[PDB]
Amino acid sequence: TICIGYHANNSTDTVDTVLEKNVTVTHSVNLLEDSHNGKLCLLKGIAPLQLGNCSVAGWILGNPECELLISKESWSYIVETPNPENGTCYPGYFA
Amino acid sequence: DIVLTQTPLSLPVSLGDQASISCRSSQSLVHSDGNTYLHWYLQKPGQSPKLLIYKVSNRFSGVPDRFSGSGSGTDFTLKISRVEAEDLGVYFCSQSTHVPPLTFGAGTKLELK
Amino acid sequence: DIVLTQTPLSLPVSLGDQASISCRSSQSLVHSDGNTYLHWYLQKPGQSPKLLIYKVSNRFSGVPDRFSGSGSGTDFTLKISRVEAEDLGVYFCSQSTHVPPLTFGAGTKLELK
Amino acid sequence: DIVLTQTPLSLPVSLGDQASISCRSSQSLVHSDGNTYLHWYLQKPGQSPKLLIYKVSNRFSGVPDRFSGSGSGTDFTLKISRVEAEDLGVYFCSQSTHVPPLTFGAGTKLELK
Amino acid sequence: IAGFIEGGWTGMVDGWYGYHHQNEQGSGYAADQKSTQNAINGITNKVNSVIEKMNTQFTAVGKEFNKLERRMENLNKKVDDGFLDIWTYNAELLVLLENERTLDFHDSNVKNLYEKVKSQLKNNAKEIGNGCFEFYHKCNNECMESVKNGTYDYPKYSEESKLNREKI
Amino acid sequence: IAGFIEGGWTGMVDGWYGYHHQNEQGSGYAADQKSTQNAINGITNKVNSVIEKMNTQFTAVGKEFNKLERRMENLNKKVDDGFLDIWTYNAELLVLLENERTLDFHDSNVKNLYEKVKSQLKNNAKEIGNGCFEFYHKCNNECMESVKNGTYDYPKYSEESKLNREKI
Amino acid sequence: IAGFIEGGWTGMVDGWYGYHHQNEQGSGYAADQKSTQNAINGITNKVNSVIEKMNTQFTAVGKEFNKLERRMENLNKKVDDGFLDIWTYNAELLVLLENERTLDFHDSNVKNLYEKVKSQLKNNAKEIGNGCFEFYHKCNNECMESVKNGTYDYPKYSEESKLNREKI
Amino acid sequence: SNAPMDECDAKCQTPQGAINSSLPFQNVHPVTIGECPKYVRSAKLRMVTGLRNIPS
Amino acid sequence: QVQLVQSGAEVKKPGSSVKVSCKASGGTFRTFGISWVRQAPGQGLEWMGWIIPIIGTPNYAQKFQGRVIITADESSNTAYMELNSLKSEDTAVYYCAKEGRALLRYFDWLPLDAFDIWGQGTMVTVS
Amino acid sequence: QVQLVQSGAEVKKPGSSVKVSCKASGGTFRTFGISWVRQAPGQGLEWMGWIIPIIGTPNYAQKFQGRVIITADESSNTAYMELNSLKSEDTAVYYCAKEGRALLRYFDWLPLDAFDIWGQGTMVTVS
Amino acid sequence: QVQLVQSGAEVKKPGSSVKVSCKASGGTFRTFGISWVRQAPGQGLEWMGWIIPIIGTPNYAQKFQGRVIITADESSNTAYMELNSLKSEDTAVYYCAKEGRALLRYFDWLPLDAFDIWGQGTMVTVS
Ligand SMILES: *[C@@H]1O[C@H](CO)[C@@H](O)[C@H](O)[C@H]1NC(C)=O
Ligand SMILES: *[C@@H]1O[C@H](CO)[C@@H](O)[C@H](O)[C@H]1NC(C)=O
C-alpha cells in the first residue's frame, strides 16, 4: 500500500491555460504588478523635481509663480500636473 | 417530449414569507456529462423571462441571494428564502439536455397576499 | 551496379498512335520506405533530360496528362495515351533508392512514322 | 549537528612544496540527489572567505588550477599541487546538504616556512 | 488515501511529488528525488527564463506632439499600440503556453513516478490503479524505503509476494 | 473493423470520438463522454481564445508622405512591414503550433479512450491492438454499454471470460 | 548492451535511430525506417520551416537624424529596439521551444520503436528494460531482421519461446 | 501626475504612483520612469510553478 | 453578447410570412449560440430553433421543420427567421436568446446550456 | 549578482539591537539565495539564516530562532537582519553571501549549493 | 530553386583539369540537393556526385572517387566540381540538377528523390 501523488494546498491562486480558464494551483508567480502606492517617491534615493502647478515651459522659462524650483539643481524625474496653470506667462509659440 | 411540468399553486404569499415552487419531469435531467441541466427563469408582464438559476443549486449573477434551488433526476424545486417586493410573476423550468429543449411549461404564478 | 536497362525499340509511331516503353532491373526499386523510386526523363537534342514522371504512377507538373506509368519490383513501363508532335526523343529510367543512382542507361529512342 | 572538523596542522610550507588539508564529518555529505555538496573556502585577514572549490572534485572559476580536491562520505581533502605566494590563510569546509549548513569549523591555518 | 489519479494530498507538506504509505510499521507522507532538483530545477530554470527574457524598460517615457504633427503622433501611437498588443500577446501567450506546459510537465512527472514504481512492483503487485500500488506480500518500512528510492529489488520480494500465483 | 490505429470511421457521424461495435445483439457506431464537453470543450476554448486574442483594427488606415519626408515614409513603412512580418509570423506560427497541438490533443484523446478501456478489459481481454478489444467471453449490448461508460466492472465478467486460462 | 534508457550508441554510425544486436549468427548496429523519412523528414520540414519563416532584410539600412529631430531619432530607435527585442525574443524562443520539441520528438521516436518492438515481443519476451529485449528462445539473424522491420510474427516464435511458461 | 510627494523610495514610478519593479510586467500605466517592467494590457499574468490544487 | 435587440411587425395575413430578427451587441457573434423562442398570449415559452452562426447549420424545432427558416449573418451579427405559410396562429412575441458557454456545435446532443441574455421586442400581429 | 555591499555600526549596548543589511548589484535579485553568516574575532563562520526574496519566508539558524529577524526587500534589492535582545556577545563581522544555483525554495531540504559571491563589510562593535 | 545556370569551357589538355559550376536562383540554396550528371556524345547520363551545401560532405560517384572534387559555396549559391588528371575522355556536357524533397542528409541511403530542375549549359571540349 504505497501511493503516488502530489501535494495539495490551501492556495486560492488561479491561472489560465489554453484549455482551461480558472485553475487553482499550489504555487505561482505573479509576473504582473497591478498596484502602486498612490505617491511620488524618490528614485534610488533621489528626489524628483515636482513642478506641481508649473509646466515644463514654466519651469525652464522661470514663470515667477514657481520660482521655488530655481533651487532644484538635480532630480530623479520631472513631474508636471496633468493640467498646468503656470507655463508660458506671455503666450506664444514655444518652438 | 422534453417535459417538466410546473405544479400550479393557489399560493399568494406575503412579503417576508418563505416560498417554493416545483416541477415534475417525464425523464431525467441528468446528462451523460454528469451535470444536471436545470434552469429557472422569471417572467414579469412585458418582460423577457430573465434567468435566475443557472444550475440546479446555483443562482446566477443577475439575481439576489434570496433565490436558490435543489433537486435530482425528475424532481426539482426553486427556493426563495424571503419573498420581497421584487418577487411577483411566472416562473418556468428549463431542461437543456436535449435538442428540443424543455417546453418551459405553463409556469408557476406567484402572487402577493 | 544500379542498373535498369531500356529495351531498344525499332518503333516509329504516327501521331495519334499509342506508345509505351519499358525497363528491366537487376534489383528491386522498392525502398524500405515502401515507395518505389522510379522516375522517367525525356531528352531532346540540345536539351536537358526533363522530368516527366516523378513516381511510378505519377506524372509530374511539367508534362501533359497523356503521359503516365506503371510497374513493380524490377519491371517498369512508361505509357503514352496518344503520341503528339511534342513526343520525339530519348527516354531514360532512373532509380533513386541507392547512393549511386541508376545509370540512366542507353535510353529508348522514339521516332515518328 | 552539521559538523565536518578541520584537522589543525602545525605545517608551515615553503613555496614550491605540495600541501593538503583534510576534514572529518559526523555524517555523510552525499545528498539524495547523488551529489556531494562539499565546498572549500579561503579566508585571509580582512577578507571574505572566498570560494575556491565548488564541488568535491571541481575547482571554481575564481581560483588557479593549482587547487583541486577529493573525498567521499565523511572523509574529504583539499589538494594544492604547488604552494605559491598567493596561498596563505585559513581554509574552511562547507556542507550544503542540510538546512543548517555546516558550521565552517575552526579552519585549517596554512603558514609559510 | 488515493493518489494523483483523483487529486493531491493535503497531508504531504514536504513534496510537489512524493509518496503516501501505510505499512505494518508505519504511516505517513514524504517527498522524493523527482521533486528535489528535478521538478524544482526544471521549474526554477523556467521561472528564471521568463524573468530574464524581459528587457528592463530604459526607454522613452513618452512624447508630446504638435497640432500639425498628427501623423507623427499617430505613428508614435501606432508604434506603442503595436508593441503593446504584440507584448500583451506575447506575455499572455507565453504565460498560457508555459502554464499549460508546466501543468503537463507536472502531470508527466507524477506519471513518471508511477511508471518507475510500476516497473519494479508490477512483477509482484496485486493491483495497480487509483494512484496506489498493492502488494502480494506484506510491507514494513524497509519495503517502502526501497520503492521510494528505486531500489526495490523485486526478485528478493517476488518469491514471497506471489499470492495470485498460489491461488491459480 | 480497425480503429484509430489505422484511421477513422465514416460510419460514425455523431462522433469526434467514439466506439464501434459488433455483438450478439447488435452492430453500429456511437460517440461518448470524451467528445462531449471534453474534446469539444477544449477545442471550443481554443477556438475562442484564438479569435479573442486579436485586437479589432480600429487603427490608422494609411498615411501619405511628402517628397522630403522619405525617411518618415520609410519609418512608417518599416513599422508596417515590421508589424506585418511579426503578425504574419505570429499568426502562422500560432496556427501551425495550435494545429500540431490540436492534432496531438486529438490523438491523445483517442489514446485516452484506449487506455480507459484497456484498464477495464485487459484483465479479461483476448487481444488488444489495431484499435480493437477482443474478449474471452461473448458480449451482448449490455457489455458494450458498460465499456463505453466506464462501468465495465470486470470482476463480474472475468470469471466467465477466461478462455486463455482454461487452455493453459 | 544498454539502449536509450541510459544513452546512445557510438557504434551506430548511419543512425538517428536503430538497433543493436547480438545473436547466434552475428553482432552489430543498424538504422531503420523510423529514422529514414520519419525522424529525418520531420526534422527536415522543421529546419526548412525555420529558415523559410525569415524575411530577407531588404529594408532600410539605417537613418541619420538632425539636432532638432531627437523625437524622430528616438522614435526610430524605439522602433529598432522594439523590433530587435521582439525578434530576439521570437528567435530565441523559437529556438528554445523548437529545441525542446525536437529533443522531445526524438525521445518520442525512440520510445515509439520500443513500443513497436514490445508489441511484438512482450508475448514471448523474457525481460523488457534498459533498452533491451530478451527472448525466451534463441535468435539468429532472421529473428533480428523480423523485429527490426516489424514482421516478427510472434505466433511462429512464441510456441518455442516459452521458457517461463515451462518453468511455472 | 497629481500624486503627492512623500518620504518613500522606489526604483520605477508611473503617473498613478510609485511601484516596486520586481516583477517583469506591470498593468498600472503605459508611461513610466526609472528601472521599469513592461506595460501590458493584460489584467493578470500569473505563472504556474506548482501543481493543480485539487485534493484527492 | 450582453444585449440582443429585436423588432416587431404589422398585421400579417394568412398565406404570407413573418420575418423576425435580432442584432447582438459586442464581439465574437460568430460563436454565440442564438436560439429563438416564442410565446402566444397567455401561454408559456416554446422553441423555434438553434444556430451557432459560423460553425454550422441550424437545428429547427420539430413542429416547425416544414414551416420555418432560421438563418444568420455573421457579418451583420444578426440572427433571422422567417415563418412561412402563415396560418395566423397565435403569435404575439418572439424572443432572441443567447446561451452561456455556447460550445461549438458538431454534435447536437451537446447540452444547450443556460440563457444568459434574453432580449425583448418582436411583437408581431397576425390576421 | 556579482557583488554584495554591506555597512557596519557603532557601539550597540546590551538590551538594544543590531541592524545589518546588504545591497546586491545586477538583476534577478528576487530569485537570489541570500544568506547571512557571522564571525566573532578568532572564530570560524556560522549561519544566521537563508532567504529567497520573492519566493518565500526565511529559514533561521536554530540558535537564532528566538533572537533574530531576517527579511528582504525585493524592490530595494536588499537583504536585512535585525539582531534583538543584544547581550553583547562577540560580534565583529557579519557577511552577506549569494549562493550559486539559487533554486526556488519550496522545500528546505533542497541543497543550499555554493556561495559564489561573498561580500565584506558590516563591522559591528558592541558594549 | 526553379533554375540552375551553368557555363562551359575551351579545350582542356590531358594532365590538366576541368572546372564546372552552376548557380541556383531563388532561396534556401543551403538545403538543396544538387547533383552532377554527365553525358558523352551518343551516350546516356551518369552520376558525378551529390551535395547538400550547408548540411554535410559530398558523396562522389565511385568511378570518380579518386578523380574529382565536388564542393559548394552556400554564400555564392553555387555548386562546383573540378575534374582532375584529365585523360581527355569523352566529355561534352555536364549537368547541374536539383532534387525534389532534398531531405537533409545524415544518412546516405536516404532516397535521392526526383530531379525537378535540371539545367543546361556546361559544354566542355577536351584534347
Ligand atoms: C475566475 O473567478 C473569478 C471569481 O473568483 C472571476 O471574477 C473571473 O472572471 C474568473 N476568470 C475567468 C477567466 O472566467
Ligand atoms: C495650485 O493652484 C491652486 C488654486 O487653483 C492652489 O490652491 C494650490 O495651492 C496650487 N498648488 C501649488 C503647488 O502651487
Residue numbers in the entry:
A (entry chain C): 6 to 100
B (entry chain F), C (entry chain K), D (entry chain L): 1 to 27, 27A, 27B, 27C, 27D, 27E, 28 to 95, 95A, ...
E (entry chain D), F (entry chain B), G (entry chain I): 336 to 503
H (entry chain C): 271 to 326
I (entry chain E), J (entry chain H), K (entry chain J): 1 to 52, 52A, 53 to 82, 82A, 82B, 82C, 83 to 123
Quote the study that presented this structure, word for word.
IAVs have two surface glycoproteins, hemagglutinin (HA) and neuraminidase (NA), that are divided into 18 and 11 subtypes, respectively. HA subtypes can be clustered into two groups based on their sequences. The IAVs that currently circulate in human populations belong to H1N1 and H3N2, which possess group 1 HA (H1) and group 2 HA (H3), respectively. Here, we use transgenic mice that reproduce the human IGHV1-69∗01 germline-encoded antibody response to the conserved stem epitope on group 1 hemagglutinin (HA) of influenza A virus to show that this germline-endowed response can be overridden by a subdominant yet cross-group reactive public antibody response.
